[PDB]
Design a protein around this ligand. Structure first.
Ligand SMILES: *Cc1ccc(S(=O)(=O)N2CCCc3cc(Cl)ccc32)cc1
Ligand SMILES: *Cc1ccc(S(=O)(=O)N2CCCc3cc(Cl)ccc32)cc1
Ligand SMILES: [Cl-]
Ligand SMILES: [Cl-]
Ligand SMILES: [Cl-]
Ligand SMILES: [Cl-]
Ligand SMILES: [Mg+2]
Ligand SMILES: [Mg+2]
Lengths: 9, 225, 225, 9
């Protein structure tokens, strides 16, 4: 599914 | 970037992010790493943001092209071109980590951050791999994530955002790469529950960060179950 | 791109658009133009889409950087770097139009399309110009748009979408570049009203295209009045 | 204000 984004947004 | 000051490269990486010029950002950060000094927390995030965006765009394009191909030689040729450029960027990132970010990182936060990156870029290589080395690429990702996990569990609290993001990404590895959906679900659940039980120790700002990543774990669990 | 077939370049430009790889798209279309043959309607749109997206991203980045600069040498240096790359792309497009797209375009639709492009890329150069040639850059945009207008008014109906888009862009030129907001408003109003009066002649699909651009004219008029 | 987009969308 989703991995960590580069920034909090 | 050899002739530009380290501090100027960092400043320009921040400007490039604001301008949404992520290829430039990555080039500035590669130049900063190549100055040979360790990176601060903020600088590690600039490096990660830059390359994650660049490769993220390549991955999205490769997926569009791979779908068209699956459904003359041009589609395959162009998918191969995008694939080779993606592999080149991953190789560049892995080369920075190997020369010499990881070996100089002694604090748990820095070493885990870089080993998580190493796992991620081997994972991106695994997404496009088909040849004699595909199993070895998968195992290289696994090994990097595993070392990061072992350090994180010894040295960081269960709410630490790097520990949480690592577990998130390793769970994605299990589900999407390693064909281990049960391992993926188990890791995400145990990570979420152990973080929940430690939230009481946190300030408002640390709470916000930990709960943000916990929601990502939960979003995956909802998709997978 | 000299060793790739024209038809393969066109095919790959379409794939690059689907993959949102606009720099690749532009390179494929430059290679197609350099084969020396005229472009069809569809191919002209591929060329325009590719470069409009590339330069559009450069313009947005230049505006972010120029704002920061207005508010060490690094910001100015980096704005200059983005500006030089933008100018290079505009020069490349203008070079394709001059060698030899415009001179070989005899039909009104092709010639107007290319002269509208010529006006647009001189307009983008004018947005960043400050030196001894700034007035000449502005006049080069004006001259290209004017020739396109003269042909369009003689050879195309007032609802033709190329004629409408040309008038839209020339009106933006008047407002944003030439410091002529009244000319901009007058052109947009007269264009809109003359198109409105010709909609009765159109099929459903032509109607949709003409009214789409009329709405853009109206949106500008609402912003400017 | 706005110029013509590359595609209808
Ligand atoms: C892998 C990872 C990297 C950085 C962080 S963080 O420093 O806590 N931080 C900064 C930018 C990315 C991000 C995203 C979320 Cl959802 C929460 C915090 C952060 C954590 C993990
Ligand atoms: C300048 C211009 C270029 C192309 C056209 S069009 O062929 O009628 N068409 C194709 C893609 C761009 C576009 C955008 C709108 Cl809003 C309407 C039609 C088109 C028109 C003008
Ligand atoms: Cl190719
Ligand atoms: Cl160290
Ligand atoms: Cl620079
Ligand atoms: Cl001709
Ligand atoms: Mg120095
Ligand atoms: Mg041939």
């Amino acid at each position: 599914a989703g991995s960590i984004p580069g920034r909090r947004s | 970037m050899g002739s530009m000051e380290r501090a100027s490269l960092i400043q320009k990486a921040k400007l490039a992010e604001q301008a949404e010029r992520y290829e430039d950002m990555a080039a500035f950060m590669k130049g900063a790493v190549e100055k040979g000094e360790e990176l601060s927390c903020e600088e590690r995030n600039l490096l990660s943001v830059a390359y994650k965006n660049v490769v993220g765009g390549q991955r999205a394009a490769w997926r569009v092209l791979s779908s068209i191909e699956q459904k003359g030689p041009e589609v395959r040729e162009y998918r191969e071109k995008v694939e080779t450029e993606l592999q080149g960027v991953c190789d560049t990132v892995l080369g920075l980590l190997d020369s010499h970010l990881i070996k100089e990182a002694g604090d748990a936060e820095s070493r885990v951050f870089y080993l998580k990156m190493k796992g991620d870029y081997y994972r991106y290589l695994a997404e496009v791999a088909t040849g004699d080395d595909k199993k070895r690429i998968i195992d290289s990702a696994r090994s990097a994530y595993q070392e990061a996990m072992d350090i994180s569990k010894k040295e960081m609290p269960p709410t630490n955002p790097i520990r949480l993001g690592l577990a998130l990404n390793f769970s994605v590895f299990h589900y999407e790469i390693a064909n281990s959906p049960e391992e993926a679900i188990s890791l995400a659940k145990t990570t979420f529950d152990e973080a929940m039980a430690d939230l009481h120790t946190l300030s408002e700002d640390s709470y916000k960060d930990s709960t943000l990543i916990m929601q990502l774990l939960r979003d995956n669990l909802t998709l997978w179950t």
